[PDB]
Design a protein around this ligand. Sequence first.
Ligand SMILES: [Zn+2]
Ligand SMILES: [Zn+2]
Lengths: 310, 59, 62, 181, 50, 49
Amino acid sequence: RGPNLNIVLTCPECKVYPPKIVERFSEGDVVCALCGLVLSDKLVDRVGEASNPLLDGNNLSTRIGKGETTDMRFTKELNKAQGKNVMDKKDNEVQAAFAKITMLCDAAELPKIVKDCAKEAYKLCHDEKTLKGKSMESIMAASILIGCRRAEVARTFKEIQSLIHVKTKEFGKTLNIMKNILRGKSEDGFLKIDTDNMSGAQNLTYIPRFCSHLGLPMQVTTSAEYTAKKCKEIKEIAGKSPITIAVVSIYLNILLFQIPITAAKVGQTLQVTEGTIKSGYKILYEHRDKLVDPQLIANGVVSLDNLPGV
Amino acid sequence: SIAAAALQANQTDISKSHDSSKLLWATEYIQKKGKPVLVNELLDYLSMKKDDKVIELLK
Amino acid sequence: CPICLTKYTQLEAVQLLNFDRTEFLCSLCDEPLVEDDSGKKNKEKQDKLNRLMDQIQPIIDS
Amino acid sequence: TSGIVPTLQNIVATVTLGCRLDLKTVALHARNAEYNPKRFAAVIMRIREPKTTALIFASGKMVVTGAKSEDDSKLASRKYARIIQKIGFAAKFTDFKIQNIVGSCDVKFPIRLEGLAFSHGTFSSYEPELFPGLIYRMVKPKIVLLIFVSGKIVLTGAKQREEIYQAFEAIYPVLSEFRKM
Amino acid sequence: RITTLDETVGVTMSHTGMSMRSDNSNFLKVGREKAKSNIKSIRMPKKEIL
Amino acid sequence: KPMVNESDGVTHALYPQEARLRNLTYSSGLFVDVKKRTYEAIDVPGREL
Ligand SMILES: [Zn+2]
Ligand SMILES: [Zn+2]
């Protein structure tokens, strides 16, 4: 369908399809690897500005700024003229939304992959019929958390809602809408295997951040990581939230390595009720050999009797 | 038929202390009907029958 | 030519025939060309002129 | 096949009466009735021998919740219509439609829910920090399911018995394959 | 002299950006203290309204 | 003291050799003790606030 407009590099003497083609970049030729006949010479291997048409689309606009000799009134008139443009109103509002997303992620000092994934999620999830009535803050929070979960750098709900003053209702519904529409777009476009990237719990990623907020050593972080990994085997704690199971595993490993911090300080820092931590410690107190890392007690750095009684 | 008694007892009397509402309800009865109305049914609309200032204020 | 959506007049389609003498073949698409529906609408445009001219008759008379 | 048939616990239906109802009269005359005009623009009542709650609106539409089965909702609507007839209003069963049926069941084995969400991800959405139950939206029929690690499965959003029964029959082999400990 | 924090860096970054400690200060919480007032009313008869 | 935060929010003390190898920035955070004060007054004409 339509014009072909395609050039195939076929050797006219060997008549072998597909031909073995060698691109001699140093000598600037395209040659046939069988006979050595050249195919295209004078090949072309800065002057413009980079613009990827996947993050913001095929938007092509330039602003007006002060030069060497600049009158202020002309600049104000040109800025007002650029303001009253009706064709790029959708482009202007999605650029303002991108600026707000990158400012809000940048005040959160998250990496650039989070901002890129949030921007592309916002672009591919914009102008949808099923998502029109939700407030913009919920859209931004859902895009931010989707971008966090895309790059194995996933965050939690409480620290997202600490920055964006949004309720749990519309944030959860917007998250579900985003997940459904992104899976639909992936099925329509390039299909992607999940392989545990938007997993619901993802409690293995919340260990070192809370350990660093508590100022624990990295061996305690690895021990709590092993404990959180082995909590999947226990059926009595499977329904618990990832945050609470991470907190109780961290507290269990603190009591294992005799780190001199209190449960009240852990509850104050990590915003968890001490009753939940005590209940998790009590239900994990019976599971001793199923949580303590076997090479840690093989090395003798920890022992089972360091845990206080219940 | 206790609901009918409740609805007929919940509503207050139309005999107000000011003639303004007493002529306003006559004008409302005039407007709500698709045909012009006579004096007798207008007088039967409110609680009295004898002449007062309401008829001359309406005229 | 509907694949390339290209016009061809009677003067410029002379040099695009095959040796089979069967069908008009395009230079780019190499596609069997189809006949335009234009030209047969001559009477339709004449009727459009007739329907414009009698309605604009008060303008001419005035 | 399934070794246990799920049982229902709430059937929500609606009946239109084709009449105008005054909320204050039915709030005052009825015994077990509540009316908060500042909160909800309808009157609320309930009856004990089916243990069902009626949402009575001013337009004649009314909603029955808390019915275990269809006949319980039928007799609840019959007694509600008797209450409306005997309270001083005229009502008729112009249209009665059942619109929601829920049910609960148990499989009595733990289910690895993470593997379930990994395999059947296109119909399910998991967020344990908000709700510990997996929300599964199957496309045929339109039944939503709440999945728990204790084996308790809650089917919600049904209209009759065949759709919820075939939903459990379809969800049984994809859930019985997961075993923990 | 300026004061150098001699504690662990993670304790200082606990309050940074993403901090799931919720904000508790009542400074300029105008949106919270003026969204709590809601008006609700019904259709009382027209005569008293007039 | 100089430190670095990672992608996942983990902050550890940064040393110049590690900073040079990982293309990081040998920087230290700055904190300020901010104090907030809210004042209210009866606003009536003819009276100093
Ligand atoms: Zn060749
Ligand atoms: Zn063509």
